[PDB]
Amino acid sequence: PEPQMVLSPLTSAAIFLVVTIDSGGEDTVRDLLSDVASLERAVGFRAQPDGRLSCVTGIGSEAWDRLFSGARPAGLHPFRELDGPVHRAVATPGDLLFHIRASRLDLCFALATEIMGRLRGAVTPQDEVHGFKYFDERDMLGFVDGTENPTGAAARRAVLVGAEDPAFAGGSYAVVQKYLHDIDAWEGLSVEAQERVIGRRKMTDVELSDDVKPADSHVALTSVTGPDGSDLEILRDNMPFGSVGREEFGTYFIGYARTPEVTETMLERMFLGTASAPHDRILDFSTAVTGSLFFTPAADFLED
Amino acid sequence: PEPQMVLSPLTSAAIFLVVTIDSGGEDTVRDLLSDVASLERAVGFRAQPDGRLSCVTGIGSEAWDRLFSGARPAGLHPFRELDGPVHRAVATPGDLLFHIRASRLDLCFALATEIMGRLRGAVTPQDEVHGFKYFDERDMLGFVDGTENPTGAAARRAVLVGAEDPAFAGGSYAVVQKYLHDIDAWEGLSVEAQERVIGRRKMTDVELSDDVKPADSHVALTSVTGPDGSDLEILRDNMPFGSVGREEFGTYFIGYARTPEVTETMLERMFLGTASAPHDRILDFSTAVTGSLFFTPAADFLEDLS
Amino acid sequence: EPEPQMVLSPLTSAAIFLVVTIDSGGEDTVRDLLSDVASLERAVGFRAQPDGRLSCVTGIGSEAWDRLFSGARPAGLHPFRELDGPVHRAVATPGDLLFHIRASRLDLCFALATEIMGRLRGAVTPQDEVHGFKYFDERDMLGFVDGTENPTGAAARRAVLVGAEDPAFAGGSYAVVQKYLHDIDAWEGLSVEAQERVIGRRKMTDVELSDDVKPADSHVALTSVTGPDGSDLEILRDNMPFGSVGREEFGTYFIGYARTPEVTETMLERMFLGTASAPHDRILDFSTAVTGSLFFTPAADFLEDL
Amino acid sequence: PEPQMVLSPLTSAAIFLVVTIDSGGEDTVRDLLSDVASLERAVGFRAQPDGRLSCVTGIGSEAWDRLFSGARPAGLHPFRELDGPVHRAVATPGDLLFHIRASRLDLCFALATEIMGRLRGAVTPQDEVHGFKYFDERDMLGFVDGTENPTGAAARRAVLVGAEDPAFAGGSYAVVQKYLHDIDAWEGLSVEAQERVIGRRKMTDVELSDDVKPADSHVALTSVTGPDGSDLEILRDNMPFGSVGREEFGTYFIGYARTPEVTETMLERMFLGTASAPHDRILDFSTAVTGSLFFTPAADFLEDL
Amino acid sequence: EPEPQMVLSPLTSAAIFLVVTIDSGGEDTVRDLLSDVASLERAVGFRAQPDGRLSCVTGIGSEAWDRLFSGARPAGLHPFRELDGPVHRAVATPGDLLFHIRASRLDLCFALATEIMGRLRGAVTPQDEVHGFKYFDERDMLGFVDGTENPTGAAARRAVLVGAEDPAFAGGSYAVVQKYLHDIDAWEGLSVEAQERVIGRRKMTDVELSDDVKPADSHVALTSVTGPDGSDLEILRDNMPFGSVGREEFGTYFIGYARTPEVTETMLERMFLGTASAPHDRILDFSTAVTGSLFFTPAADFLEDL
Amino acid sequence: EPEPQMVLSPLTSAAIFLVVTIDSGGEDTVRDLLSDVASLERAVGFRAQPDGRLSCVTGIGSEAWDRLFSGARPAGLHPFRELDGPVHRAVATPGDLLFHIRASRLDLCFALATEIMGRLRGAVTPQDEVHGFKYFDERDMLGFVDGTENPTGAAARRAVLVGAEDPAFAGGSYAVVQKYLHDIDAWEGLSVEAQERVIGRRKMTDVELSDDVKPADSHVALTSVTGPDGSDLEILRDNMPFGSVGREEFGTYFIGYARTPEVTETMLERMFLGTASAPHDRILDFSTAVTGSLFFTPAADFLEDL
Numbered sequence A: 001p002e003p004q005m006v007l008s009p010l011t012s013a014a015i016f017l018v019v020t021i022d023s024g025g026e027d028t029v030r031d032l033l034s035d036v037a038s039l040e041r042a043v044g045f046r047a048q049p050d051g052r053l054s055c056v057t058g059i060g061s062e063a064w065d066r067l068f069s070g071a072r073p074a075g076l077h078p079f080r081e082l083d084g085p086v087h088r089a090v091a092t093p094g095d096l097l098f099h100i101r102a103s104r105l106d107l108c109f110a111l112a113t114e115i116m117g118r119l120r121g122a123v124t125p126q127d128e129v130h131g132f133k134y135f136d137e138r139d140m141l142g143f144v145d146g147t148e149n150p151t152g153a154a155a156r157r158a159v160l161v162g163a164e165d166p167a168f169a170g171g172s173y174a175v176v177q178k179y180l181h182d183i184d185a186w187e188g189l190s191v192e193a194q195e196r197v198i199g200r201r202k203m204t205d206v207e208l209s210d211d212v213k214p215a216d217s218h219v220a221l222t223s224v225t226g227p228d229g230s231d232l233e234i235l236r237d238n239m240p241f242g243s244v245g246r247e248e249f250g251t252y253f254i255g256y257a258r259t260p261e262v263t264e265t266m267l268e269r270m271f272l273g274t275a276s277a278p279h280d281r282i283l284d285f286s287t288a289v290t291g292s293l294f295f296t297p298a299a300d301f302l303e304d
Numbered sequence B: 001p002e003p004q005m006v007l008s009p010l011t012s013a014a015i016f017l018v019v020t021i022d023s024g025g026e027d028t029v030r031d032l033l034s035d036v037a038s039l040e041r042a043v044g045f046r047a048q049p050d051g052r053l054s055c056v057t058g059i060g061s062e063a064w065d066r067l068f069s070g071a072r073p074a075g076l077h078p079f080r081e082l083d084g085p086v087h088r089a090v091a092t093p094g095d096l097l098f099h100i101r102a103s104r105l106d107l108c109f110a111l112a113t114e115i116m117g118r119l120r121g122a123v124t125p126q127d128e129v130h131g132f133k134y135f136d137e138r139d140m141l142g143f144v145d146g147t148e149n150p151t152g153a154a155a156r157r158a159v160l161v162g163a164e165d166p167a168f169a170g171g172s173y174a175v176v177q178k179y180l181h182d183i184d185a186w187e188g189l190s191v192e193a194q195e196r197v198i199g200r201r202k203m204t205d206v207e208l209s210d211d212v213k214p215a216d217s218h219v220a221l222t223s224v225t226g227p228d229g230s231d232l233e234i235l236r237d238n239m240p241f242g243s244v245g246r247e248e249f250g251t252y253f254i255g256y257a258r259t260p261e262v263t264e265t266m267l268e269r270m271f272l273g274t275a276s277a278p279h280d281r282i283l284d285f286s287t288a289v290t291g292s293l294f295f296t297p298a299a300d301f302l303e304d305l306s
Numbered sequence C, E, F: 001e002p003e004p005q006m007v008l009s010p011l012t013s014a015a016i017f018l019v020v021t022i023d024s025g026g027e028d029t030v031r032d033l034l035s036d037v038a039s040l041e042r043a044v045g046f047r048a049q050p051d052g053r054l055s056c057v058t059g060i061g062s063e064a065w066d067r068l069f070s071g072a073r074p075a076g077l078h079p080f081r082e083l084d085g086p087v088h089r090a091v092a093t094p095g096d097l098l099f100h101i102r103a104s105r106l107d108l109c110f111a112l113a114t115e116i117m118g119r120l121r122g123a124v125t126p127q128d129e130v131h132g133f134k135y136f137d138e139r140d141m142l143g144f145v146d147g148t149e150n151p152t153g154a155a156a157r158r159a160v161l162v163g164a165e166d167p168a169f170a171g172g173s174y175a176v177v178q179k180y181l182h183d184i185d186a187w188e189g190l191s192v193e194a195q196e197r198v199i200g201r202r203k204m205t206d207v208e209l210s211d212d213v214k215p216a217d218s219h220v221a222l223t224s225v226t227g228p229d230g231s232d233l234e235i236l237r238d239n240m241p242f243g244s245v246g247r248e249e250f251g252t253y254f255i256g257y258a259r260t261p262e263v264t265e266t267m268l269e270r271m272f273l274g275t276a277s278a279p280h281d282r283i284l285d286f287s288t289a290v291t292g293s294l295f296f297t298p299a300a301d302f303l304e305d306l
Numbered sequence D: 001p002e003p004q005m006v007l008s009p010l011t012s013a014a015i016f017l018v019v020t021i022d023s024g025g026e027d028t029v030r031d032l033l034s035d036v037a038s039l040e041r042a043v044g045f046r047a048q049p050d051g052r053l054s055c056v057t058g059i060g061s062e063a064w065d066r067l068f069s070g071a072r073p074a075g076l077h078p079f080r081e082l083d084g085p086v087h088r089a090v091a092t093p094g095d096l097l098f099h100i101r102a103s104r105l106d107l108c109f110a111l112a113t114e115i116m117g118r119l120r121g122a123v124t125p126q127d128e129v130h131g132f133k134y135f136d137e138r139d140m141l142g143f144v145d146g147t148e149n150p151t152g153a154a155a156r157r158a159v160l161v162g163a164e165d166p167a168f169a170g171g172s173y174a175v176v177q178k179y180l181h182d183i184d185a186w187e188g189l190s191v192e193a194q195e196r197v198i199g200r201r202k203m204t205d206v207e208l209s210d211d212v213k214p215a216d217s218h219v220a221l222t223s224v225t226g227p228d229g230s231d232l233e234i235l236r237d238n239m240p241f242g243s244v245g246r247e248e249f250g251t252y253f254i255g256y257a258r259t260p261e262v263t264e265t266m267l268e269r270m271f272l273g274t275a276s277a278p279h280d281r282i283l284d285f286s287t288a289v290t291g292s293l294f295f296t297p298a299a300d301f302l303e304d305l
Ligand code: HEM
Pocket: B139, B141, B143, B144, B145, B146, B147, B148, B149, B177, B179, B198, B200, B218, B219, B222, B223, B234, B238, B251, B253, B255, B263, B266, B267, B282, B286
């Protein structure tokens, strides 16, 4: 089975499009899904090899039942709201995700235009975010973002559905959350205090030693070990976005994994806390305003 | 006199920020203007040589009178509304323009963040547009955009104030207009009908012959000769922008010239027409929602303030 | 595991196509060169890496094969078959060896071509030499993006490389070449919309026409073939423009690779002889074939071990 | 005065087009000349900044009098044939030159297509050459080619007409010659013997010292001093070309100068020799098969027709 | 199953070679660093991706292996073997750990080397540090292209990575290093043709000399070795120039990776001890070895599992 | 017009600094090389254009000038003046000739240095050789962006090039070099905020600290100098990191160019001897100077006419 381009090369621009399917829009949606790979080639081919254009398409739990009969992916369910003592992860509506990436925003925009052109009248937009990465892979908090992502074979094993759900092998599960940051509060911390929040050095991106790293730092809470002592990993492609005039400074979080359990365990640790940590300290500077879960099928499933 | 970076190399990303100065905000604004070149170097220097970051700062007619106590530039006035039989060019408020360009949007965003950080509490944002160019220099209508801009010495002559206003030599005048397109109506035209609107071939960007090019084409109406028969020229750096969810497809127009009279003559021809043409056909698919005029001083004028 | 030649190359913007016939008594000289051609490719190319992207694919025709080698023949190797349609003809022309040379720059192609022909002088007669160049946005001489639906990755390997069905020749491929000359004056008299109906895709945006509007005699419709089981039958193309402005020669050099020549030959039959619904491929009303040849491109190790 | 792009950045591809103007063709030609800068922008602008497309347009002596009335450039005359004791510099016909340069051959070809499309039925092609430079600035003989070209203000002074002919300021003079090489004979020399022909080291491109450099080497014979003791300089953009099937391996020579007398003095030294040198040794491996001289006007002269 | 270190790297234009010995009592500090070296690589390199191309290959010598680890040894791990030829000598010098650091720029190499040695200060003693740079056309200090006949793709994996013959250490490799200093004055007194007879390839074009003219004591002849079964025995080299103009030091840093040290050692024996037809490799009359060490480079997961 | 050497070079990522002394009897050989150095620069660099950006700036010290030339001397040429502060010392060390070689890659620097030293062998003795590399975001070994406030364009030409004040030497410049070694262990014991107070700029974003927070003994405060007439006195710097990981040597090679040595020397006096408000530059508590030399860099035509 041929996967979608979940494992993409590094890209400096992205568009995230989340829509809901209107009553009676099902047929139009199914037609577009069968064409989205051809649209990706049409927009991208003439800008190769620098364009690096890809589109990953996902389908929500409620939408799946409206579009398809027969088997469901084993782990597909609606995003679960988490109501912590201090911080909340909200659930927001979304039936379809288009995660569009390239080396330039114009290519993302051209593909997004063709997709939405085909769906007009059949869907309602819920969210549209145009992301850009800083030139040294830093996010809006000023930390390098992506460093511990798995690569090569380890990435395939962490991200792609396999023999545990063989009809849907080559798929993946995506969790998205849009975060807005309190930059005034963040810039009031010393650099060393910021390092204790994240769990890595700011300028050099070296992980703090185990003797200094706080238990409520972001890296400590999002490190999870499996039954056998292996690291359970996800693949992230977080993107900054925002608007200077409205004072909106954001991180758009997207995490891919072979089962949603990994990502959801990380989120529970962050928002509900553990015995040793009240919550993830990154959340004292970051508010989640969307939350959705999608299954991203193998490419050949869509081509039918 | 050292000009600001009006004549920039080609860039693929831009931010246009237009603000108004709140009552009592004048001193904070003057301070920022004296530091804006230093901020540009701080954000940009470490991303050289590929970043190509620049900021051009412009000041409106009413803002000028509030900020500075001596001489005014000879051509500085508020944008003049044009009320045509069919189409209107509106005037909208704006005291400061920051025209920020680079090879990537993140550099534009970082400089815009530092600028607005210093101005918080002294200004109110009126417009913010994040622009991106298509990879073959096309605009939202699918035509190459920029081709007949002047270059080298001819660009300097067309854009920079000289001896005619010597205390402001090295400055320029910018007009901005944000345009929204009706893409559904545009895409219902045949390609040949689109070419008759613009005045150039779509795929190859070759200008149509004088025998076929209509009088109400964009290129015909924006071609102006002077008293002496010489071409009057401006320098444009138009940028696409929009939002696919809201069906917003735009062109952000910006034109620089040594005197606003050149730009204003072009706009009069477009909106009010001539003997041979009712109006520029591009306006049947393009609506202006902003309009403002600014003077962009020489860099040393900004540096030497308190 | 048998190592293929570089049939699946990265994108290249320059090519030289060299077709020669083996003179009487030239066989030994040719066999010696074939055993050295991979080493010549490395010699010319290694010092220009990683940007040079130099490769050479070497092919051998049906009649030449019997003169050079004893033992087994590849199952699908035969002379190119002439197709004599009601209006258009696909000619067959002589060729014993093909050198398909590709790089990011023409000079690298030329240096490799010079070393190869230097070794073969006196043993071969040149039949065709074409210097090809791709336009900067992957467009061909007709102004359409060319290569978009080529297969990639595993699907390309499956469509192109001989496997278990002919195990002695696994890792080989079959190449068909045809040099085409265009009537550019007639082509440019069509509207863009009418050109799109010839090809089956939009010209500017390269989006395929919807199934309800795509004509039955468009290029894309006639070259879309399904197998017995309903799977798409695919080939890998690397078509190149060529020409001479002084002689008014504007061309496309067609080269198609496939695991069996049956796929390519079925597409050619549909183009030239037509179907129930289509007289012929409308691209042929603006394109004349003046060469036609078929070659087997062995696995690299087969050439080395002789 | 705005010059044409005689002083171009380094380019790896070129097309040279030489044509003659047919009976009745003058009006069609004048129209094209007034549009050629706009054609260059149309083809090139959308491929910027990597394309680096330019076109330099030249006009021959005879053609000038057919196209324009009034003043002539002071140094414009037909190419002068040189019949040396061993080697000959031929003159061949040419009314118009288009020297098209870019980073890629497809862009050169697209501009050449638009130009010749406009001229069809008014001109006859005499020569068409598609040139490519080797990736380390080498020519067909394997030597770095271009090294001692002038740059900056020294280039402007060597190439552009100034006050000496003020109506034609910003123009230049181009000489072209297509050369075919005997590559078999060249490659039979040792590297050291090839270095003595050129006057520079082959791998490192360091000039041989004056005590070792022979008097009949290419660099010695093309080094010329003026009345004042100053170096007389030209700007060259030589390009390889060829066809492997026809065994055609060439250099297309093009040299620009403020007056043709500089280039002509170099040609006399190469073909007729000096007191100490019979001829340029490069000519024992290089045969000229074309030769033409053109004036390349300032850009505004063409625009104002 | 086993993930190799980045032995098969893309081409890189900068390198740092660091050889150290482990001081008495330094073993625990070293084991801790080895378990973190891949994390340090990501920390320095991720923010310069994708163009940085930073990698570190870590090797362990024979005597150090016994100090660090209990249990199985790699089958081919032994101390470098000194070769005492009639004229030329290959010396053995001390070295417990190798860090072979490569990237597209030297500053990335330097930053990673700084982090590594920061962790090891007080536990190791440096024996050699070389900063290498490539010439722009892949040439070495002798003016010849260097790397041409390296294997690529599948053939490289087969020649370099330990497999089923030593399954506990599958995905590992063996590295031999030698630092060479050249007598450039003697070399530059040769004619080019005499230099070509030393190396066995043409200098400007890098084409191999024919079998009839290539001397038996040329570098290429002596380092071409066939196995019992007739197959070529291959290694992967990434030689780097280095030097200091003021001290007249012009060097080649040799590093050769292979699946077993026997291949590399057979080449070294032929170079230094000769054959029946060749006293020694002529390259050694202009090149003196001043270091010599052998290391095993484990699979990446073996290092992580500490 | 006198043609300057390439003091105002584009940004380069690699450098070699070579300082030598002229041996007794070496004068003639040196004069010959000086007349050829521009020719050697073109020979090494032309074949790597346009990306190579190779340049060489040649300087001559005070004592060497009097050995090589007769007649008039540049007005400000004297030996480097040792500064003996209460805590910190700026040493003077020997040097007759400077070669400041810059390019986009180290191999071009190295090849030109090799040809220069080849011609001078036997006539000079090397005193210092440093191979410099820039970090990818223009940072120095202290982790701060280095070069941000250099002057550019016309302002740089005015700050650097000799003019009418010394008309026989117009187009020349004065270069001061100092090699600094840093105590990185002490430096990394400071917090980031304490480091920012040493330099006078924010570390990550390179924004200058406000005048109300910037200490009087910060690097930026002490190296900001105004003239009697209120003008900023500026120099042009091209500082390069260098080092050796095994010896724990981390350095900055300082080079500053100015139209008169008085500007540079005033900055050095403020740093080493202090002012009324500041004992010394706090950067010197983590930075030791181990060389110090002053050279005059003549106009290019002065060197050619020898
Ligand atoms: C909706 C807004 C606009 C769009 C999409 C647009 C687009 C274009 C295009 C595609 C061209 C042809 C290629 C080129 O030379 O750039 C052009 C030319 C031009 N436009 Fe616009 N334009 C717009 C508004 C304006 C306005 C408001 C002005 C003046 C106030 C203006 C002045 C010009 C000029 C002077 C030219 C060059 C004509 C010549 O000399 O050939 N444009 N524009």
